[PDB]
Write an enzyme that holds these catalytic residues in place. Structure first.
Site, PDB file in Angstrom:
ATOM      1  N   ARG A 148     -47.743 124.463  96.121  1.00  0.00           N
ATOM      2  CA  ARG A 148     -46.810 123.430  96.557  1.00  0.00           C
ATOM      3  C   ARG A 148     -47.591 122.125  96.673  1.00  0.00           C
ATOM      4  NH1 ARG A 148     -43.187 126.111  95.130  1.00  0.00           N
ATOM      5  NH2 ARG A 148     -41.421 126.895  96.362  1.00  0.00           N
ATOM      6  N   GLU A 167     -40.635 115.655  94.054  1.00  0.00           N
ATOM      7  CA  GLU A 167     -40.319 116.008  92.676  1.00  0.00           C
ATOM      8  C   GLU A 167     -38.890 115.571  92.350  1.00  0.00           C
ATOM      9  OE1 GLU A 167     -41.178 120.217  92.234  1.00  0.00           O
ATOM     10  OE2 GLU A 167     -43.295 119.966  92.740  1.00  0.00           O
ATOM     11  N   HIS A 216     -43.684 121.252  87.509  1.00  0.00           N
ATOM     12  CA  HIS A 216     -43.266 122.501  88.143  1.00  0.00           C
ATOM     13  C   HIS A 216     -42.683 123.476  87.121  1.00  0.00           C
ATOM     14  CE1 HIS A 216     -41.946 124.060  92.352  1.00  0.00           C
ATOM     15  NE2 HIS A 216     -42.139 125.078  91.532  1.00  0.00           N
TER      16      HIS A 216
END
Ligand SMILES: NC(=O)c1ccc[n+]([C@@H]2O[C@H](COP(=O)([O-])OP(=O)(O)OC[C@H]3O[C@@H](n4cnc5c(N)ncnc54)[C@H](OP(=O)(O)O)[C@@H]3O)[C@@H](O)[C@H]2O)c1
Ligand SMILES: NC(=O)c1ccc[n+]([C@@H]2O[C@H](COP(=O)([O-])OP(=O)(O)OC[C@H]3O[C@@H](n4cnc5c(N)ncnc54)[C@H](OP(=O)(O)O)[C@@H]3O)[C@@H](O)[C@H]2O)c1
Lengths: 333, 333
Positions: free
Chosen positions: A241, A270, A288
């Site tokens: 993360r 994000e 991601h």
């Protein structure tokens, strides 16, 4: 198939089709993430929800979802869900562990290798035509990178993905170090992994890989203090993360040469944008995409459906995150 | 230290310093590769030469180097040297095997993973600010790539690097197939590798990796016919030599979707430029940086020196390529 489920993103059809035979399904299909105002509107009548990390399932959502009894995250992490509040309300929370382990571990190594060997920089050099235009074929110091084989890898978080990363590290004959909340002597025996206090792991590793979930305890675990402990030739890889790393501190460490580089698949926000970070040619960035493999996406879709269907049938969902909820309220709508 | 050696590129100082104590050393230090006219001038009085792939050591060079007795290639490949002509003249030819095996095998896997998971494309998307500007955090189909773990890898050329690649493939629990000039039953036993005729390897592999030297027999081994045999979901990785692949055929295969992508570290001409190839977002390119690691560069420099010094002492160079030359002329200046 009277139970109603709202899915916040167009996940693989295999999972949607499984749910269609047991629930009344609705699927958000807009280009952008579902707006907060619309989410609050949609959860008003649903019995179940299939969410992405982009949706913050907090007390406000629960207060607006009177019929909600189960939330299935299409992700293995669940820092986007107020688990304590859910449990209290008798709401079951499920995730997608294991089915995305190999895709994420594969990407972790993809970043480790790409960062160590300047693959992105090299590709740009060739692809842009700079290589040809300058007319020089080769130099001994061009794209000089770090060896991986036989080097030391320090895995922070020896869970499902951390162990998968360690298995791959053995293929590269690496010295495996790890720091985790729980010691796993059997893994230490099987993979020749060695437990090390966080400080010693940072000082001894040539590659530091983050594979811990985001919690109060892991927030900014990699700060300025710890970046200074790492070797100046070491590379940091984050597939966990973004908030596990103090980005400002990392950028400072890279600009000042405290570490050699970093490969990041996750960020503090994000989508993300950081001009200072993006200027550095010793970093590799991906949006991601850890579980972005055909197999992972499919397994995740089937697992989400399995959890909701099991719940409908009065069974305990296979990947229930908050098992205390079972005693609060038996499974079912 | 009367023997004279000319080195065509500024290789690591460790090797140059070793040679300085045994030879009169000269090192080309220009930005560009040494011009042909200057090379012919420089070889006129030398007893030994340390060359790069950029230098074509053919009959013309030998005809102009009357004192030349040993050529040490700073590379493991030697397709740039007329070995037959050298042997005939009693000229010893050495290369740098083994010391760059792990760096090249590491890069091979870096390309395999980067190509399979769209790392270069993903980095561009984030770094350019496109990710943020478009305001969408995530989509299930974005950068969807291929799983590597448990998949089938087909290695063409099971030599030093081919085997190193296979060892790494075991860390990813892959099914290992290989096609090579020499069968190695022991490697088949130890790594669970399985020999397959070239045609069957191409049809069964999810990843095809080239690790053969460039010869008359390997020239354009991967042509249109063979590209059609590969799975449409398969990825081709080339860390061998560019001429082992028919580039026009490859570009056609990629544009038409005969294969899923390709990772290339070598090209038919270097530096290289191919507009059609460079437009494809399913390819990853690097400028022949296979052995570009700190350890490999150093080992290569020490090995080149070891070979020349051994020769000066009347010993057979450790990594002599043309052993028939020993019977033609005993080692020494
Ligand atoms: N980038 C991507 O696309 C992607 C994909 C999948 C997952 N992820 C991230 O990776 C995380 C881990 O996934 P996973 O399935 O491996 O989870 P998992 O099996 O729980 O593994 C997490 C590991 O972190 C350890 N840990 C937790 N808190 C810690 C602390 N304070 N200090 C040290 N170690 C701690 C856990 O220890 P224990 O034995 O004590 O619980 C466990 O070993 C996910 O939560 C998610 O945030 C990202
Ligand atoms: N990209 C880079 O920076 C980089 C770095 C290092 C090397 N390379 C390239 O990689 C090549 C191989 O290096 P290495 O040390 O592994 O060489 P090596 O040990 O000789 O391995 C070459 C392998 O190719 C096999 N082979 C040769 N001709 C063949 C044919 N016609 N059909 C099928 N297989 C054949 C050889 O079989 P045998 O057992 O019969 O001889 C051997 O198994 C080098 O020659 C060079 O061109 C590139």
């Amino acid at each position: 198939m009277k139970p109603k489920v709202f899915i916040t993103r167009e996940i693989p059809e295999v999972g949607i089709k499984m749910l269609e035979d047991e629930f009344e399904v609705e699927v958000w299909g807009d280009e952008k993430e579902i707006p907060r105002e619309i989410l609050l509107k949609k959860v008003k009548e649903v019995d179940a929800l299939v969410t992405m990390l982009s949706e913050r399932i907090d007390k406000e959502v629960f207060e607006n979802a009177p019929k909600l009894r189960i939330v299935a995250n299409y992700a293995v992490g669940y820092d986007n869900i107020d688990i304590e509040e859910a449990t209290k309300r008798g709401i079951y929370v499920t995730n997608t562990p294991d089915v995305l382990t190999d895709a994420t571990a594969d990407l972790a190594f993809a970043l480790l290798l790409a960062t160590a060997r300047h693959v992105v920089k090299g590709d740009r050099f060739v692809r842009s035509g700079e290589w040809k235009k300058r007319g020089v074929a080769w130099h001994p110091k061009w794209f000089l990178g770090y060896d991986v084989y036989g080097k030391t890898i320090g895995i922070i978080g020896l869970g499902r993905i951390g162990q998968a990363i360690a298995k791959r590290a053995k293929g590269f004959n690496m010295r495996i170090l790890y720091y985790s909340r729980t010691r796993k002597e059997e893994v230490e025996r099987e993979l020749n992994a060695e437990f090390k206090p966080l400080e010693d792991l940072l000082r001894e590793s040539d590659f530091v890989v983050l594979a811990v979930p985001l919690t109060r305890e892991t927030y900014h675990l990699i700060n300025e203090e710890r970046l200074k402990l790492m070797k100046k030739t070491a590379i940091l890889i984050n597939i966990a993360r973004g908030k596990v790393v103090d980005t400002n501190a990392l950028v400072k460490a890279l600009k000042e040469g405290w570490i050699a580089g970093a490969g990041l698949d996750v960020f503090e926000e994000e989508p993300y944008y950081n001009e200072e970070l993006f200027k550095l040619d010793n970093v590799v960035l991906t949006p991601h995409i850890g579980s972005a493999s055909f197999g992972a996406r499919e397994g995740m879709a089937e697992l989400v459906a399995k959890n909701l269907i099991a719940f409908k049938r009065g069974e305990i969902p296979p990947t229930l995150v908050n098992r205390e909820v079972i005693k609060i309220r038996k499974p079912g709508f």
